[PDB]
Design a binder for these strands. Structure first.
Ligand code: ATP
Ligand code: MG
Ligand code: MG
Length: 373
DNA sequence: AGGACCC
DNA sequence: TGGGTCCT
């Protein structure tokens, strides 16, 4: 149970794909999916015309005045298609980890070993790659790690084919020996293509990044820290004193991220299974006057009740989240949480009242059910 | 409850 | 600055 073969599957412009399937007439039009004042994503036609992920509508339309916009505030259809993709990949191999609605990791190691035991000491020399090899690296058919990663690429090509044939969806895949690398390599050829990373090109991929922030695992706060410390490139992080890093970020963060900077990442692909929470949100200018807007809270409620029904399991906890007024101090939302009574688990209106009291304990309103059982 | 990370 | 995860 040593060396792994992991695939990362990463769909193209996922919300825009879902909307193009729904309304074919948007098919070869540049398309942006809007949420409030943002174009959260857009199809590849629009990316050619300058439209970028998460651009304001204004910038978006004065870069491209012919841009078609559809509202993507209601996530229902995205969410449903997102689970269809996960279940299809689960069928290839059951340990599938979701990351957001349109990325999945699959640990292919058992699958690859089983396919390999199937082949003769004849056809092992006909093993070929499917799709791109990162950095155009030469394959060595006598290297058992090259052979396993190639079989990995063939399984990823089957997955992408099946997603297209069964669900109508295109996507990228990256095959590598761990989740970090699979995730960095999946993005090298886009849209709708795949890439496999052989071990000798690992430093090349890692040093191809232009800032430590691009490392999956290193976010906004951590990047700001490393900066303050004079750490900008992936090589700065590789060569920095482990000790000062430790005595500044904590042992956990320091040792994990410095391993990341080498391309090293032991984290297991984790079975996501069914979701741990269910929530819906609503943004607005500053429209929750702090009074008559429980009305919002009932709408949110009605949808969530229909969803959390549908699941089979039921939530034992409810939470209310808010965002307070005026100026924008970069970190700060607030939440009141209490258990749901069992009278009420097993007829909207008692739920309506719990929510209102937690409101009374305390631009954004959301309800979240959790602690599913 | 809130932080930090992800898409 | 419309969702989700897991750690502190
Ligand atoms: N910050 C965000 N706010 C709202 N929705 C988001 C946000 N980040 C991502 N999404 C949504 O999640 C989906 C997947 O995100 P992702 O970063 O993979 O981009 P994508 O739209 O699939 O484009 P690409 O082809 O580059 O992968 C999108 O279609 C959108
Ligand atoms: Mg992605
Ligand atoms: Mg994507």
């Amino acid at each position: 149970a040593s060396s792994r073969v992991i695939v990362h599957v990463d769909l193209d412009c996922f919300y825009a794909q879902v909307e193009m399937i729904s309304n074919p007439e948007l098919k070869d039009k540049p398309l942006g999916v809007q949420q409030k004042y943002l174009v959260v994503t857009c199809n590849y036609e629009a990316r050619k015309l300058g439209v970028k992920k998460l651009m304001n509508v204004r910038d978006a339309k004065e870069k491209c005045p012919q841009l078609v916009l559809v509202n993507g505030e209601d996530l229902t259809r995205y969410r449903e298609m997102s689970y269809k993709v996960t279940e299809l990949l689960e069928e290839f191999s059951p340990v599938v980890e979701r990351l957001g609605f349109d990325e999945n990791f699959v640990d292919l190691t058992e699958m690859v070993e089983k396919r390999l035991q199937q082949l003769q000491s004849d056809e092992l020399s006909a093993v070929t790659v499917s799709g791109h090899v990162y950095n155009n690296q030469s394959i060595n058919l006598l290297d058992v790690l090259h052979i396993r990663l190639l079989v990995g690429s063939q399984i990823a090509a089957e997955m992408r084919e099946a997603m297209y044939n069964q669900l109508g969806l295109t996507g990228c895949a990256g095959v590598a020996s761990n989740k970090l690398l699979a995730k960095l390599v999946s993005g090298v050829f886009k849209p709708n293509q795949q890439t496999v990373l052989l071990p000798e090109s690992c430093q090349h991929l890692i040093h191809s990044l232009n800032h430590i922030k691009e490392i999956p695992g290193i976010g906004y706060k951590t990047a700001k820290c490393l900066e303050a410390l004079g750490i900008n490139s992936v090589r700065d992080l590789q060569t920095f004193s482990p000790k000062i890093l430790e005595k500044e970020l904590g042992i956990s963060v320091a040792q994990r991220i410095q391993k990341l900077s080498f391309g090293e990442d032991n984290s297991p692909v984790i079975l996501s299974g069914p979701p741990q929470s269910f929530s819906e949100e609503d943004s607005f200018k500053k429209c929750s006057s702090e009074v008559e807007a429980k009305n919002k809270i009932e709408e949110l409620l009605a949808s969530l009740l229909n969803r959390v029904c549908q699941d089979g399991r039921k939530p034992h906890t409810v939470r209310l989240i808010i965002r307070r007024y005026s100026s924008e101090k970069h970190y700060g939302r607030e939440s009141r949480q209490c258990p749901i009574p069992s009278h009420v688990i097993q007829v909207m209106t008692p739920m309506v009242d719990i929510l209102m009291k937690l409101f009374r304990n305390m631009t954004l309103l959301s309800v979240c059910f959790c602690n599913l059982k």
